[PDB]
């Protein structure tokens, strides 16, 4: 018998798209603040097995570089996923178009990203859509991974399953998802962390998509690093990007090896 907090007022929009939106919410009492993803389960096909799968995965999660799940309310047919509020905003907005950000800052964000991904992969979960818009800064300006709407489980019982499904955001997607039927999930997330890195350091994405029909991508395979955005990236992290942006997912650097990378371990 103690009523007053858990009734949230939708204070303002944060980022709306085609599924509802996200609202900063404040408890009418505790004054607690949270992010609320609004989503109407309209019909039954692109939801009954979409938003539900997202809640399922959010419950498994618990790491400091992963946005927190505080429950959900499915009263009628509208879904409210109470999620951790990160007043720092999206990593996207700290990237100065065509400039990026101070290398030290990028290195710190990359470490937190790697810690988050290391965490996820360890519990057999793959995000499948890592990008600056999905990476948020909390009140301390520390990076946390969010939106697991496209995420899934690939390992468990100590057994790894292979993927084949083609999802994600083009510019940030790995080539195997465009030329292979099946593929390991971990290598894809790493590839995407590599694109985020490029963006933080260069303030621009390398290509529109990873295909030989894309010049920018072809130039990369040909080592034309005198071309943007590479020319804007110091040789140390560029050397790491060379290890991450490898077409053959079997020859791609693993996370345990990125942590052994010089630039990665460099005191900046
Ligand atoms: N799935 C999922 C998910 N879980 C937790 C959160 N967002 C999610 O959604 C991620 C895509 C959301 C778009 C980014 O949202 C946001 C946008 C802005 N800036 C808005 C702003 C404030 C002041 N001036 C300019 C812009 C802020 Cl300050 C926070 C969030 N997001 C959150 O606090 N939490």
Short mmCIF file of C-alpha atoms and ligand atoms in Angstrom, two decimals:
data_model
loop_
_atom_site.label_atom_id
_atom_site.label_comp_id
_atom_site.label_asym_id
_atom_site.label_seq_id
_atom_site.Cartn_x
_atom_site.Cartn_y
_atom_site.Cartn_z
CA UNK A 1 0.00 0.00 0.00
CA UNK A 2 2.12 2.89 -1.33
CA UNK A 3 0.82 4.86 -4.39
CA UNK A 4 2.41 7.81 -6.29
CA UNK A 5 5.29 6.62 -8.51
CA UNK A 6 5.10 4.58 -11.74
CA UNK A 7 2.73 6.99 -13.51
CA UNK A 8 4.87 8.69 -16.12
CA UNK A 9 4.22 11.93 -17.96
CA UNK A 10 5.51 12.06 -21.54
CA UNK A 11 7.75 15.15 -21.30
CA UNK A 12 9.22 15.32 -24.81
CA UNK A 13 10.19 13.50 -27.98
CA UNK A 14 13.69 12.10 -28.38
CA UNK A 15 13.54 10.23 -31.68
CA UNK A 16 10.52 9.02 -33.63
CA UNK A 17 10.40 6.67 -36.58
CA UNK A 18 8.16 4.06 -38.18
CA UNK A 19 7.19 1.99 -35.12
CA UNK A 20 6.21 4.76 -32.74
CA UNK A 21 8.89 6.83 -31.01
CA UNK A 22 10.90 7.32 -27.83
CA UNK A 23 9.84 9.73 -25.09
CA UNK A 24 11.71 11.16 -22.12
CA UNK A 25 9.42 10.38 -19.19
CA UNK A 26 9.26 11.65 -15.64
CA UNK A 27 7.50 9.90 -12.78
CA UNK A 28 4.69 12.10 -11.41
CA UNK A 29 6.30 11.62 -7.99
CA UNK A 30 9.65 9.89 -7.51
CA UNK A 31 10.66 12.30 -10.23
CA UNK A 32 12.51 9.35 -11.72
CA UNK A 33 13.33 9.84 -15.40
CA UNK A 34 13.28 7.19 -18.14
CA UNK A 35 13.11 6.66 -21.91
CA UNK A 36 9.92 5.12 -23.24
CA UNK A 37 9.71 3.49 -26.66
CA UNK A 38 6.13 3.81 -27.90
CA UNK A 39 4.96 1.15 -30.37
CA UNK A 40 1.49 0.10 -31.60
CA UNK A 41 1.34 -3.64 -32.32
CA UNK A 42 -0.95 -2.86 -35.27
CA UNK A 43 -2.10 -5.97 -37.13
CA UNK A 44 -0.11 -9.18 -36.58
CA UNK A 45 2.98 -10.00 -38.67
CA UNK A 46 5.54 -7.21 -38.30
CA UNK A 47 5.11 -7.07 -34.53
CA UNK A 48 3.86 -10.30 -32.88
CA UNK A 49 7.41 -11.55 -33.51
CA UNK A 50 9.29 -8.24 -33.45
CA UNK A 51 8.69 -6.09 -30.36
CA UNK A 52 8.21 -9.23 -28.29
CA UNK A 53 11.58 -10.61 -29.34
CA UNK A 54 13.09 -7.27 -28.34
CA UNK A 55 11.66 -7.45 -24.84
CA UNK A 56 12.85 -11.03 -24.54
CA UNK A 57 16.46 -10.03 -25.24
CA UNK A 58 16.36 -6.89 -23.09
CA UNK A 59 15.59 -9.07 -20.10
CA UNK A 60 18.74 -11.15 -20.61
CA UNK A 61 20.89 -8.00 -20.63
CA UNK A 62 22.78 -6.41 -17.76
CA UNK A 63 26.05 -4.57 -18.40
CA UNK A 64 27.25 -1.01 -17.85
CA UNK A 65 27.71 -0.34 -21.60
CA UNK A 66 24.23 -1.56 -22.48
CA UNK A 67 21.08 0.56 -22.05
CA UNK A 68 18.95 -0.83 -19.18
CA UNK A 69 15.52 -2.46 -19.35
CA UNK A 70 13.07 -1.42 -16.65
CA UNK A 71 10.01 -3.34 -17.81
CA UNK A 72 7.08 -2.80 -20.17
CA UNK A 73 3.33 -2.18 -20.30
CA UNK A 74 1.05 -3.79 -22.89
CA UNK A 75 -2.29 -2.68 -21.46
CA UNK A 76 -4.36 -2.54 -24.65
CA UNK A 77 -2.46 -2.78 -27.93
CA UNK A 78 0.17 -0.08 -27.48
CA UNK A 79 3.55 -1.19 -26.22
CA UNK A 80 5.61 0.89 -23.81
CA UNK A 81 9.15 -0.39 -23.26
CA UNK A 82 10.65 1.42 -20.30
CA UNK A 83 14.29 1.93 -21.13
CA UNK A 84 17.24 3.67 -19.56
CA UNK A 85 17.40 7.42 -20.19
CA UNK A 86 20.76 8.66 -21.47
CA UNK A 87 20.75 12.47 -21.22
CA UNK A 88 23.98 12.62 -23.20
CA UNK A 89 22.16 11.91 -26.44
CA UNK A 90 23.23 9.93 -29.50
CA UNK A 91 26.88 9.36 -30.37
CA UNK A 92 25.71 10.51 -33.82
CA UNK A 93 25.45 14.10 -32.53
CA UNK A 94 29.01 14.31 -31.14
CA UNK A 95 30.39 13.59 -34.62
CA UNK A 96 31.14 16.86 -36.42
CA UNK A 97 30.21 16.31 -40.11
CA UNK A 98 33.37 15.76 -42.14
CA UNK A 99 35.59 16.16 -39.06
CA UNK A 100 34.69 13.55 -36.48
CA UNK A 101 35.99 14.26 -32.98
CA UNK A 102 39.26 14.42 -30.99
CA UNK A 103 41.00 11.05 -31.38
CA UNK A 104 41.26 10.56 -27.60
CA UNK A 105 37.48 10.87 -27.30
CA UNK A 106 36.94 8.43 -30.16
CA UNK A 107 39.34 5.98 -28.50
CA UNK A 108 37.41 6.16 -25.21
CA UNK A 109 34.09 5.65 -26.94
CA UNK A 110 35.52 2.72 -28.92
CA UNK A 111 36.68 1.00 -25.70
CA UNK A 112 33.23 1.28 -24.18
CA UNK A 113 31.72 0.01 -27.43
CA UNK A 114 34.11 -2.95 -27.46
CA UNK A 115 33.27 -3.70 -23.82
CA UNK A 116 29.57 -3.65 -24.63
CA UNK A 117 29.99 -5.90 -27.70
CA UNK A 118 32.43 -8.22 -25.84
CA UNK A 119 29.66 -8.50 -23.23
CA UNK A 120 26.91 -9.27 -25.75
CA UNK A 121 28.89 -11.85 -27.72
CA UNK A 122 29.87 -13.56 -24.48
CA UNK A 123 26.22 -14.16 -23.69
CA UNK A 124 25.73 -15.34 -27.25
CA UNK A 125 23.80 -12.25 -28.38
CA UNK A 126 24.33 -10.27 -31.57
CA UNK A 127 23.01 -6.73 -32.05
CA UNK A 128 23.06 -6.75 -35.90
CA UNK A 129 22.56 -3.00 -36.22
CA UNK A 130 25.40 -1.12 -34.54
CA UNK A 131 25.60 2.53 -35.61
CA UNK A 132 26.07 6.07 -34.15
CA UNK A 133 22.30 6.54 -33.89
CA UNK A 134 22.02 3.36 -31.78
CA UNK A 135 24.90 4.35 -29.48
CA UNK A 136 23.98 6.72 -26.64
CA UNK A 137 25.87 8.77 -24.07
CA UNK A 138 24.59 8.68 -20.51
CA UNK A 139 24.75 11.48 -17.96
CA UNK A 140 28.51 10.86 -17.59
CA UNK A 141 29.01 10.90 -21.35
CA UNK A 142 29.76 7.17 -21.32
CA UNK A 143 28.59 5.04 -24.25
CA UNK A 144 25.79 2.48 -23.92
CA UNK A 145 24.45 0.16 -26.64
CA UNK A 146 20.74 0.41 -27.39
CA UNK A 147 17.85 -0.82 -29.51
CA UNK A 148 17.84 -4.59 -29.71
CA UNK A 149 14.89 -4.69 -32.08
CA UNK A 150 16.97 -6.57 -34.65
CA UNK A 151 19.17 -8.46 -32.16
CA UNK A 152 19.15 -12.24 -31.67
CA UNK A 153 20.77 -15.24 -29.91
CA UNK A 154 23.46 -17.14 -31.84
CA UNK A 155 25.23 -19.11 -29.11
CA UNK A 156 24.06 -20.89 -25.96
CA UNK A 157 24.43 -24.34 -24.36
CA UNK A 158 27.93 -23.61 -25.65
CA UNK A 159 26.75 -24.12 -29.25
CA UNK A 160 26.95 -21.53 -32.02
CA UNK A 161 24.23 -21.20 -34.64
CA UNK A 162 24.90 -19.58 -38.01
CA UNK A 163 22.93 -16.70 -39.49
CA UNK A 164 21.89 -15.82 -43.03
CA UNK A 165 19.19 -13.18 -42.65
CA UNK A 166 19.94 -9.81 -44.24
CA UNK A 167 19.19 -7.01 -41.79
CA UNK A 168 20.90 -3.84 -40.62
CA UNK A 169 21.76 -0.40 -42.01
CA UNK A 170 23.49 -0.63 -45.41
CA UNK A 171 26.50 1.67 -44.93
CA UNK A 172 27.29 -0.21 -41.71
CA UNK A 173 26.71 -3.74 -42.98
CA UNK A 174 29.36 -6.40 -43.62
CA UNK A 175 29.83 -7.86 -47.17
CA UNK A 176 29.01 -11.45 -46.18
CA UNK A 177 25.41 -10.39 -45.66
CA UNK A 178 25.29 -9.39 -49.34
CA UNK A 179 27.23 -12.23 -50.97
CA UNK A 180 26.88 -15.18 -48.57
CA UNK A 181 23.96 -17.40 -47.66
CA UNK A 182 25.17 -18.24 -44.13
CA UNK A 183 27.70 -16.60 -41.79
CA UNK A 184 29.05 -16.21 -38.25
CA UNK A 185 27.31 -13.40 -36.36
CA UNK A 186 30.25 -12.09 -34.34
CA UNK A 187 32.35 -11.05 -37.37
CA UNK A 188 29.49 -8.83 -38.55
CA UNK A 189 29.21 -6.81 -35.35
CA UNK A 190 32.97 -6.26 -35.41
CA UNK A 191 32.81 -5.02 -38.97
CA UNK A 192 30.16 -2.47 -37.94
CA UNK A 193 32.18 -1.27 -34.94
CA UNK A 194 34.82 -0.60 -37.54
CA UNK A 195 32.52 1.69 -39.50
CA UNK A 196 31.50 3.61 -36.37
CA UNK A 197 35.22 4.04 -35.70
CA UNK A 198 35.75 5.46 -39.17
CA UNK A 199 32.89 7.93 -38.60
CA UNK A 200 34.09 9.10 -35.18
CA UNK A 201 37.59 9.66 -36.51
CA UNK A 202 36.68 10.97 -39.97
CA UNK A 203 33.21 12.44 -39.65
CA UNK A 204 32.10 10.52 -42.70
CA UNK A 205 31.22 7.00 -43.78
CA UNK A 206 33.60 5.24 -46.23
CA UNK A 207 31.00 3.90 -48.66
CA UNK A 208 27.28 3.56 -49.36
CA UNK A 209 27.58 -0.23 -49.21
CA UNK A 210 30.31 -2.92 -49.14
CA UNK A 211 30.15 -4.19 -52.71
CA UNK A 212 32.50 -4.32 -55.67
CA UNK A 213 29.89 -2.26 -57.49
CA UNK A 214 30.72 0.62 -55.12
CA UNK A 215 33.83 2.61 -56.12
CA UNK A 216 34.59 3.85 -52.60
CA UNK A 217 34.54 0.24 -51.42
CA UNK A 218 36.67 -0.92 -54.34
CA UNK A 219 39.19 1.81 -53.62
CA UNK A 220 39.41 0.47 -50.07
CA UNK A 221 40.16 -3.07 -51.27
CA UNK A 222 42.87 -1.51 -53.43
CA UNK A 223 44.47 0.21 -50.43
CA UNK A 224 43.86 3.74 -51.74
CA UNK A 225 44.23 5.18 -48.24
CA UNK A 226 45.33 8.54 -49.64
CA UNK A 227 41.62 8.95 -50.36
CA UNK A 228 39.04 10.26 -47.88
CA UNK A 229 38.06 9.37 -45.27
CA UNK A 230 41.23 7.33 -44.63
CA UNK A 231 43.57 10.22 -45.34
CA UNK A 232 41.97 11.99 -42.40
CA UNK A 233 42.75 9.12 -40.02
CA UNK A 234 46.11 8.79 -38.26
CA UNK A 235 48.17 5.76 -39.27
CA UNK A 236 47.72 4.00 -35.89
CA UNK A 237 43.96 3.69 -35.90
CA UNK A 238 43.94 3.33 -39.70
CA UNK A 239 46.11 0.24 -39.24
CA UNK A 240 43.45 -1.13 -36.90
CA UNK A 241 40.71 -0.31 -39.41
CA UNK A 242 42.70 -2.31 -41.97
CA UNK A 243 42.34 -5.30 -39.64
CA UNK A 244 38.63 -4.80 -39.04
CA UNK A 245 37.41 -3.94 -42.54
CA UNK A 246 38.42 -7.24 -44.13
CA UNK A 247 35.95 -8.75 -46.62
CA UNK A 248 36.72 -12.37 -45.74
CA UNK A 249 35.01 -12.74 -42.31
CA UNK A 250 37.37 -15.65 -41.61
CA UNK A 251 40.40 -13.40 -41.92
CA UNK A 252 38.77 -10.56 -39.98
CA UNK A 253 40.28 -9.58 -36.65
CA UNK A 254 38.45 -10.90 -33.60
CA UNK A 255 37.72 -8.80 -30.55
CA UNK A 256 40.38 -10.56 -28.45
CA UNK A 257 42.91 -9.39 -31.08
CA UNK A 258 41.62 -5.82 -31.28
CA UNK A 259 42.32 -5.47 -27.54
CA UNK A 260 45.91 -6.45 -28.43
CA UNK A 261 46.07 -3.63 -30.97
CA UNK A 262 48.59 -0.84 -30.46
CA UNK A 263 46.31 2.08 -31.09
CA UNK A 264 43.76 0.39 -28.90
CA UNK A 265 46.24 0.15 -25.99
CA UNK A 266 47.76 3.58 -26.63
CA UNK A 267 47.59 6.11 -23.72
CA UNK A 268 46.12 9.22 -25.33
N1 LIG B 1 15.71 0.97 -28.33
C1 LIG B 1 16.00 1.88 -27.70
C2 LIG B 1 16.33 3.01 -26.85
N2 LIG B 1 16.58 2.83 -25.49
C3 LIG B 1 16.88 3.92 -24.67
C4 LIG B 1 16.93 5.26 -25.19
N3 LIG B 1 16.68 5.48 -26.60
C5 LIG B 1 16.37 4.36 -27.44
O1 LIG B 1 16.13 4.71 -28.82
C6 LIG B 1 17.27 4.88 -29.68
C7 LIG B 1 16.90 5.57 -31.02
C8 LIG B 1 16.41 6.88 -30.32
C9 LIG B 1 16.84 8.23 -30.92
C10 LIG B 1 17.82 8.45 -29.75
O2 LIG B 1 17.10 8.75 -28.56
C11 LIG B 1 17.56 9.83 -27.76
C12 LIG B 1 17.78 11.23 -28.23
C13 LIG B 1 18.24 12.26 -27.32
N4 LIG B 1 18.43 13.53 -27.76
C14 LIG B 1 17.39 14.41 -28.22
C15 LIG B 1 17.83 15.85 -28.13
C16 LIG B 1 17.84 16.52 -26.89
C17 LIG B 1 18.26 17.87 -26.84
N5 LIG B 1 18.65 18.55 -27.95
C18 LIG B 1 18.64 17.91 -29.16
C19 LIG B 1 18.24 16.55 -29.29
C20 LIG B 1 18.49 11.90 -25.94
CL1 LIG B 1 19.02 13.06 -24.83
C21 LIG B 1 18.30 10.58 -25.45
C22 LIG B 1 17.83 9.50 -26.34
N6 LIG B 1 17.62 8.15 -25.88
C23 LIG B 1 17.51 7.66 -24.54
O3 LIG B 1 17.67 8.34 -23.53
N7 LIG B 1 17.20 6.34 -24.37
#
